[PDB]
Amino acid sequence: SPITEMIEYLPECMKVLLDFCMLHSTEDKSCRDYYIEYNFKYLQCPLEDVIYEPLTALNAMVQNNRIELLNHPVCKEYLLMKWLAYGFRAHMMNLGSYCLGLIPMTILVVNIKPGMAFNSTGIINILDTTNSYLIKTCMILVFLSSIFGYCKEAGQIFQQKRNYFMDISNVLEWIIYTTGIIFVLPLFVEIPAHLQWQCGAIAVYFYWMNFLLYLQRFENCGIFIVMLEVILKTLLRSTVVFIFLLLAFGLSFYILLNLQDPFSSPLLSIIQTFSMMLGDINYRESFLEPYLRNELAHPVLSFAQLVSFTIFVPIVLMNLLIGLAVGDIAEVQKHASLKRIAMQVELHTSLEKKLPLWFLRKVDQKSTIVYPNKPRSMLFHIFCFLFCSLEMEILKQKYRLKDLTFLLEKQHELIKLIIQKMEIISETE
Amino acid sequence: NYFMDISNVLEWIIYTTGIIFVLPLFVEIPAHLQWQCGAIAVYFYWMNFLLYLQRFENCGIFIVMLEVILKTLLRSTVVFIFLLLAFGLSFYILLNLQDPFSSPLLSIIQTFSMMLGDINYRESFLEPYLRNELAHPVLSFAQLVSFTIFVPIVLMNLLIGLAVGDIAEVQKHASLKRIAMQVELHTSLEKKLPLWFLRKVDQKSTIVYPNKPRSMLFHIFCFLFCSLEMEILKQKYRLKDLTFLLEKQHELIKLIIQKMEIISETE
Ligand SMILES: CCCCCCCC/C=C\CCCCCCCC(=O)O[C@H](COC(=O)CCCCCCCCCCCCCCC)COP(=O)([O-])OCC[N+](C)(C)C
Ligand SMILES: CCCCCCCC/C=C\CCCCCCCC(=O)O[C@H](COC(=O)CCCCCCCCCCCCCCC)COP(=O)([O-])OCC[N+](C)(C)C
């Protein structure tokens, strides 16, 4: 299609073409009745036996890195119309389906004291029925949300066909739903309180850790999560150097400092050196005051181990992590403004494939009218409250020089023809 | 139009709170409310004086960098809230018998204090474990190692990288920003002056003596005070002139062949 070819090859002509789809009313910004009109006849499907994915021109602009065309106001109003059509509704539905399981477990935690067992009748201590209705409704909501998650994931097992294995969000959801089921089960089957609160800890922790993955779809929140992913994978890659260096210092401090309680076991010494990584060395408690009481076996080697540990782990390794973090964040923020709109257009073109086609005909609109002086009204007010080039130059240079040398070659051939056909009298010999 | 401005809000807080701090010369007020207002009044006076420091040249760029990093932290605060709420509710569950985690809100504030690296490993994790006072000890040490990996190492270095990027972005254009703020200050202050004063104080030419230092007031003021794109563009202009002249020359040579006389070279 010619629009995709203009996006791929000559984007400035596509900008000129998009400039025609901006109809100004009277060129007076002070007028309350002033408006502008956006037409979307070039952004639509090329048909309007092969099939096309939705948002053809937008995917072509994203895949060709034409970020100056994504920031064009026709494209911005096209994404805004596409959002207010169905995307906000589907996104709030998807978020509420998880938040319906998120909220009552947090209420159930912050009301009931940990350690105690509780049925649907109340808190077993002797028992009370003060807020038993709220506890019962919260356990019913968490149980129904968990079995709905089981049904959805059991559908996605047969839908994915052994392709969901290399995904951490599915693993987190299995942990959340199983652990919340075991936390809720004392309304049916009696379970001791130790296992119940052991599961309540893990369930609340992984609920609020998994909600960050639902935060990826926003524009003002996704880039922090992307940077978090990059730095966490880099730490994952450095963990073996972490393990061997920390194991060196842990076994060494297990040997030299044996009589002290923080280094009694080798595993406790490993965890103590991991706590000492950040700089909480405890110099006076572990090294100085045992030395002044003659309680250090091998004191000279102990202070040498202290100065070697303080040089290696909290200074060198931590600044290595800081430098890796600065490099990775600079790498991500080099391409952030394209990444935001790319995630938005990927969200819209992934959600639009599953919608029914009559709904897609009914909600679609080919042109919009914006009044700049009149603010949008209630729901839109609440939404506004909650919301708050040298390579191509040398390439053109090279094209013009190639045209120049072609014309000069033709001219040289014509001059040789002149010498071949010229008449020479009184200049011979 | 003054609604979307934080300096006006700070000034409302300062003047109301200072009025309530001063009022016991007129109307008797208990000392609790009086010193409660004195705290807030002194704090916001000295926080607001930084905004008055923006108009200097040697001081404004630090305030601009402070604005940029503080707005970036404002943008990251929701990830802060959810991550810290995860760890706060978790340590409220597993560490219940200890005084720093008695309430859920106290556990939230304790994890916020543990953000920087003041973990208190020996007081909260080790010595209760050696006295058999930890319910769920294995899960507690797993929560400890997970917290120490996530919050003080990963999130703080994320803040450091964002800070380095923002400060590099600001100091890329600092020398223009200083003189731009100065000329904006002068062109904003000059609009409100009376025009006869602007005629009287203006001067069309100055004389500077480099060898003689300026005198007293000026001495106290001196004591208190202490390109490849255009090249290729010109390249492109010269090449366009070159190809225009060569086009004219080619047309002249075709005219030569059109008007040339050929004898004894035909056929
Ligand atoms: C002595 C000891 C020394 C040891 C040193 C060890 C040092 C090693 C340190 C760290 C390595 C371990 C990191 C594990 C996860 C990293 C990969 C990952 O999730 O990235 C990506 C998302 O991730 C993100 O970008 C968001 C981040 C939020 C996820 C947090 C949950 C983790 C809780 C665990 C805590 C367990 C503790 C439990 C205890 C009770 C997922 O990968 P992807 O497929 O690219 O993206 C798909 C994303 N969608 C499409 C699915 C949405
Ligand atoms: C568990 C908890 C977890 C929570 C995590 C939370 C993390 C979130 C962290 C931070 C977000 C909160 C930041 C609030 C202000 C940021 C915007 C701002 O002022 O920037 C700009 C100026 O600002 C500057 O550049 C100078 C900076 C000085 C101002 C300090 C006063 C703040 C005192 C509050 C303390 C309250 C405490 C009181 C208690 C007693 C103003 O914006 P502007 O209009 O662009 O510029 C106009 C400037 N002129 C023209 C007017 C001059």
UniProtKB/Swiss-Prot annotation, chain B:
Cellular localization per UniProt: Cell membrane
The GO molecular function terms of this record are: calcium channel activity; channel activity; identical protein binding; intracellularly gated calcium channel activity; osmolarity-sensing monoatomic cation channel activity; temperature-gated cation channel activity; voltage-gated calcium channel activity
Q: Which species expresses this protein natively?
A: Homo sapiens
Q: Which UniProt keywords apply?
A: ANK repeat, Calcium, Calcium channel, Calcium transport, Cell membrane, Coiled coil, Disease variant, Disulfide bond, Glycoprotein, Hydroxylation, Ion channel, Ion transport, Membrane, Oxidation, Repeat, Sensory transduction, Transmembrane, Transmembrane helix, Transport
**Which start and end residues of the full protein are shown?**
798 to 1079 of 1119
- UniProt topological domain (Cytoplasmic) ranges: 54-65, 164-267
Q: What is known of its domains?
A: C-terminal helices from the four subunits associate to form atypical coiled coil structure; this region is probably involved in binding the inositol polyphosphates that are required for optimal channel activity (in vitro).
Quaternary state and interactors? Homotetramer. Interacts with TMEM100. Interacts with EGLN1. Interacts with the scorpion wasabi receptor toxin at the same site that electrophiles but in a non-covalent manner.
Quote the disease note of the record. Episodic pain syndrome, familial, 1: An autosomal dominant neurologic disorder characterized by onset in infancy of episodic debilitating upper body pain triggered by fasting, cold, and physical stress. The period of intense pain is accompanied by breathing difficulties, tachycardia, sweating, generalized pallor, peribuccal cyanosis, and stiffness of the abdominal wall. Affected individuals do not manifest altered pain sensitivity outside the episodes.
One Gene Ontology term from the biological process aspect of the record: cellular response to cold
Tell me the name of the encoding gene. Answer: TRPA1
The residues that cross the membrane are: 2-26, 33-53, 66-95, 137-163
Site, as annotated: Crucial for calcium permeation:
118
Please report the PTM annotation for this entry: TRPA1 activation by electrophiles occurs though covalent modification of specific cysteine residues in the N-terminal cytoplasmic domain. Hydroxylation is required for TRPA1 activity inhibition in normoxia. In hypoxia, the decrease in oxygen concentration diminishes the activity of the hydroxylase EGLN1, thus relieving TRPA1 from inhibition and ultimately leading to channel activation.
Q: Which residues lie within the membrane without crossing it?
A: 105-125
Please give the residue positions where the record annotates the modification Cysteine sulfenic acid (-SOH).
59
> Which parts form a coiled-coil structure per UniProt?
230-259
Annotated a 1,2-diacyl-sn-glycero-3-phospho-(1D-myo-inositol) binding sites: 234-240
Function description:
Ligand-activated Ca(2+)-permeable, nonselective cation channel involved in pain detection and possibly also in cold perception, oxygen concentration perception, cough, itch, and inner ear function. Has a relatively high Ca(2+) selectivity, with a preference for divalent over monovalent cations (Ca(2+) > Ba(2+) > Mg(2+) > NH4(+) > Li(+) > K(+)), the influx of cation into the cytoplasm leads to membrane depolarization. Has a central role in the pain response to endogenous inflammatory mediators, such as bradykinin and to a diverse array of irritants.
> What does the entry list under GO cellular component?
apical plasma membrane; axon; plasma membrane; stereocilium bundle
Topology check: give the Extracellular ranges.
27-32, 96-104, 126-136
Family statement: Belongs to the transient receptor (TC 1.A.4) family.
Supply the name of the protein.
Transient receptor potential cation channel subfamily A member 1
